């Protein structure tokens, strides 16, 4: 301020800071493959 220091403003309002949390969840997929299908196919399903 300019003239507010004389009347008030004995302290200037500091920035009230705030913490925003990133909870950091996990993204997980678990598809179920058969052992027969994993062995019979010419297509490499394990890498597909």
């Amino acid at each position: 301020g300019w003239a507010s220091e004389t009347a008030a403003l004995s302290e200037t309002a500091t920035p009230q800071i705030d913490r925003i949390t990133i909870p950091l969840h996990e993204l997980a997929a678990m598809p179920k493959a058969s052992q027969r299908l994993l062995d019979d196919s010419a297509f490499d399903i394990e890498t597909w």
Binding site: W2, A3, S4, E5, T6, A7, A8
Partner: protein
């Protein structure tokens, strides 16, 4: 720094009944005839001559000291000398928001140099344009009996003189008016920057 009085004396606080006795009691014409309210108008003229030469107050009237900038960093000597209890140190801004303060200063009383003398080195700063304003009650006591009696006699030696002779007519006493005042004048030797 205007320093107008808030309220004057009531008039009933002044010793008009006693000043009639200092005028002619024990020796005299009789009680005689004196315009009573005239005798009140010479006591107010003799007190206001000794309130100015001594810079004292003598009846404990209420004052209002509204000045713009602080002279020192923290000191602020008050002119009217025998003080007690700052009423308020309200602080008005250039528009008139009148935000009082209630701490940061401690009046240090003294008959010589009454002060404000804030705590530490920070005295309330002034809003730009917004004059600071100090209300205080300065003087000895509420009644006439609470005064130093030598100063009260200087009023009676002076108010009787304004009663005894009207115009400015000519007329060296050991303790006259002037010798009773000089131990209540303010002895200052500063003509400097502080």
């Amino acid at each position: 720094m205007m320093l107008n009085e808030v309220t004057a004396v009531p008039g009933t606080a002044l010793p008009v009944a006693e000043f009639r006795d200092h005028l002619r009691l024990g020796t005299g014409f009789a009680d005689l005839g004196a315009e009573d309210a005239a005798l009140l108008s010479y006591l107010r003229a003799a007190i206001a001559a000794i309130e100015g030469r001594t810079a004292k107050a003598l009846i404990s009237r209420g004052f209002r000291l509204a000045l713009t900038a602080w002279r020192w960093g923290d000191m602020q000597t008050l002119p009217i000398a025998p003080v007690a209890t700052v009423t308020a140190l309200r602080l008005v801004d250039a528009a008139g928001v009148e935000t009082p303060v209630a701490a940061g200063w401690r009046l240090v009383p003294d008959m010589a140099r009454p002060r404000i003398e804030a705590l530490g080195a920070m005295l309330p700063m002034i809003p730009t344009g917004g004059r600071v304003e100090i209300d205080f009650t300065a003087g000895f006591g509420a009644s006439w009996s609470a005064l130093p009696v030598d100063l009260a006699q200087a009023v009676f030696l002076l108010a009787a003189q304004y009663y005894e002779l009207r115009h400015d007519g000519a007329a060296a006493m050991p303790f006259g008016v002037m010798a009773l005042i000089e131990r209540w004048r303010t002895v200052r030797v500063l003509g400097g920057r502080p």
